[PDB]
């Protein structure tokens, strides 16, 4: 498919704030396949095996890297500037465009890495969809994969993201997962943090707000999942668990230490829920621009209507 | 169950800018059920057949109005003041709190309304809950059933709602649909429009954006489908549906003239789309914050096609 150029060229690349250079050879298409015709250059190799003589993959841009160990094979195809380092393995029908591929990271399948950067042993395959702006840090590893679609998000350390889920603007660490139908939205003001072992699957939303630092947090072990949705200045600690069609908006909102909210619970405005406290039914819990203080052991549900912090049981004694 | 109060007094309303003043008795419990002891007073009715004896309806607040035709029947519950006239009809497990409901509307089974008003015949039932501000003003009448819920909302004309769809902060109007699973978000600097016989459903999204007037904007008959998702500021127009897993984010963006993005299509920035145009497959067509893109077709966009500018 290719020769390499004769004389070699020096490139520069920059890790971890250091400026690096390496010493690389251009492809240079020997015969017709594909949509690369025969006699053009591409991007540039330390070693023939980096790029495969077989399939269709293919470097495009003359200021492409690949090299240090990774093997591009398959029909994948690498466009734009792009850097691939370090044990690097790229195949099947997979695409990167102007993004940065390093350190062990094998992309599988017929996955897209476009306008983004991806750095150490993960494992991104399927269909999944890593897209302006994101960054993947992984050190079980950290998998992207199914349908899941990232954009401008920071995923790290082992996280897992997959089924059809939707994440923007996000900030998911640790190990946090994020699958089924799943529907992160941050915007251009407010991240969503999704923290340590949360999880938000099944048909789930987390909607940051527009408030300053109306960032939906998600902590610990708690999840959102089913039909329930979740927006504005939000955080969820300790064992909490927001399912059925329940719907928590306003804030400033905090859940902690065994809250489990369904059904068609509505919870809205600045409201403190915590201590083994169940609310489910059609029960709705709203602070109009006001505050409330749930505690309990307590169930609310059937048609309570809570605008004020119940002065009874669990509220004046604990213990 | 309940006898009226003999001393009838005069309550007033709004009605359109205006003034109103209408006689009525106060109900006031005889027995005891569910959850009204015998002895306490309730809110206020012009007839005795406007609360049934039957059931475990009731109307709480003493000051609250139901009157000219409005029938309050089975396990209704009307909370808080809640004004409820002109023909409407109120029954099953219903729970009506601090609402305004008028004109012929018929609320049933478990519907919840809090907070917002409805007006003029249309169809509530199933399990719909119409909360916080919503504003609900109706050949078809509109209706919200099956799961559907309404935050801050404006819902007019012959409005379909139902399945699970969840909209907040929007304005949906004429004979838009919104069901399956779909999302209407808006949020307090932009609301979302969905308008003549647009629909949104499967696991649609329409975000409204945080920029000035980022609002998503369906008209005529565009329909956002499947996991499609649309952000900020764009525009649905003539013969236009979004569907498969395409995302199209940005602005401002117009989709106008038999135009199809599905796939997994991204697509984001200033971009104008019209002309039987197709984008699917693994495509990216980003106008990069400066930029602008104008694609005219007939033309087909798949696979790895990325474009950047016109
Ligand atoms: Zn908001
Ligand atoms: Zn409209
Ligand atoms: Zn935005």
Not at 28 to 49: E, H, L, R
Not at 181 to 195: M, P, Q, R, S, T
Request: proline share 2%; with cysteine; aromatic share 6%.
């Amino acid at each position: 498919k290719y020769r390499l150029s004769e004389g070699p060229r020096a490139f520069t690349y920059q890790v971890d704030g250091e400026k690096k250079s390496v010493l690389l050879r251009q492809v240079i298409a020997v015969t017709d396949f594909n949509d690369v015709k025969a006699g053009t250059s591409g991007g540039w190799v330390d070693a023939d095996n980096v790029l495969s003589q077989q399939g269709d993959c293919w470097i495009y841009d003359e200021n492409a890297m690949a090299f240090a160990g990774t093997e591009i094979t398959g029909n994948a195809r690498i466009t734009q500037p792009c850097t691939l380092y370090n044990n690097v393995r790229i195949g099947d029908n997979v695409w990167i465009d102007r993004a940065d591929i390093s350190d062990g990271a094998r992309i599988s399948d017929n996955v897209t890495i476009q306008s983004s950067s991806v750095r150490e042993e993960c494992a991104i395959y399927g269909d999944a969809r890593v897209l302006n702006q994101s960054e993947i840090l992984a050190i079980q590893i950290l998998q992207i994969y199914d349908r899941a679609t990232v954009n401008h998000s920071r995923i790290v350390h082992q996280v897992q993201l997959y089924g059809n889920a939707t994440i923007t603007h996000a900030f998911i660490e640790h190990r946090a997962e994020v699958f089924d139908f799943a529907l992160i939205e941050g915007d251009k003001d407010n991240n969503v943090w999704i923290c340590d072992c949360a999880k938000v699957y099944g048909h789930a939303r987390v909607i940051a707000g527009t408030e300053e630092d109306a960032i939906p947090t998600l902590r610990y072990s708690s999840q959102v999942a089913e039909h329930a949705l979740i927006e504005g200045n939000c955080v969820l600690k300790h064992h909490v668990l927001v399912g059925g069609h329940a719907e928590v908006r306003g804030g400033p909102i905090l859940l902690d230490d065994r809250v489990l909210i369904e059904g068609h619970a509505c919870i809205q405005g600045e409201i403190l829920i915590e201590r083994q406290v169940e609310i489910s039914g059609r029960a709705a819990v709203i602070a109009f621009d006001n505050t409330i203080h749930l505690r309990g052991p307590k169930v609310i549900n059937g048609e309570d209507r809570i605008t004020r912090t119940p002065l009874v049981g669990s509220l004046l004694e604990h213990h």
